[PDB]
C-alpha cells in the first residue's frame, strides 16, 4: 500500500496539526510506504538515507501510538551519535508540540520517548533511570553506522532488557550482513521497504 497524502493515513488530529505546522505538505516516498505499517504495530525494516523525511517517518509512527496521559517511557530510539540523538529529539518535539508529547535525549516525570546512543541508554537502564516496563516501540536509526561504531553487543543487551512483545523499527541507508543479522534476531515477519 502506498498512501500519497497524510490526511488518508488515519492519523490523530493533534499529530496532523504538528505535521502541517512543521511545514510538511505531501508525504515523501518513504513516508507513503512506511507510516501505515509502523502505526499498525508491525516490525519494519526501512532502507532510508539521513534526512528529515526519514526521521519524521518514525517520529509520526511513535507519536501516533503514544498514550499521552500515561506518563511513562513508551518508545526508545537508538542513534549512533549525540548529535543525531538531539536532531531526532528536535524533530519529535516539533511534530508532537500540539499533543503534549515529551522526549528526552540520553547523551550524557518519565518522558514518553527517550532517544540516545546505545552506551548511554544501556547505562540508564542499568542505573534504573529508565524503566523498560512500558516501552512498546524500539527504533534503531542508522543501524549500519551503530554497528560500524562497534555498538552491536550493547544493542543486543538493551534488546534483552525489553519486553518480548515490542515493535522493532530499523532504519539504515545500507544493509550489510551485520544489519541483516540484527533484523533476523529482533524481528518477526517484518515489513521490508528497501
Numbering used by the authors: 30 to 137, 151 to 236
Task: Quote the paper.
DExD/H-box RNA helicases, from virus and bacteria to eukaryotes, play important roles in processes including ribosome biogenesis, RNA processing and folding, ribonucleoprotein (RNP) remodeling, RNA nuclear export, the regulation of RNA translation and transcription, and nonsense-mediated RNA decay. DExD/H-box proteins often contain accessory regulatory domains and localization modules, but their cores consist of two RecA-like domains joined by a short flexible linker. The N-terminal domain is commonly referred to as conserved domain-1, or DEAD-domain, and the C-terminal domain as conserved domain-2, or helicase domain. Both domains contribute to the binding site for RNA substrates and both contribute to ATP hydrolysis. We used X-ray crystallography to determine the structures of the DEAD-domains of DDX2A, DDX2B, DDX5, DDX10, DDX18, DDX20, DDX47, DDX52, and DDX53, as well as the helicase domains of DDX25 and DDX41.
Also known as eIF4A2, an isoform of DDX2A. Two of the structures show unique P-loop conformations. The DDX2B structure features an α-helix 4 that is longer than in other helicases, and leads into an unusually closed P-loop conformation. As a consequence, the ATP binding site is not visible on the surface of the DDX2B structure. This conformation is most likely induced by a crystal contact in this region.
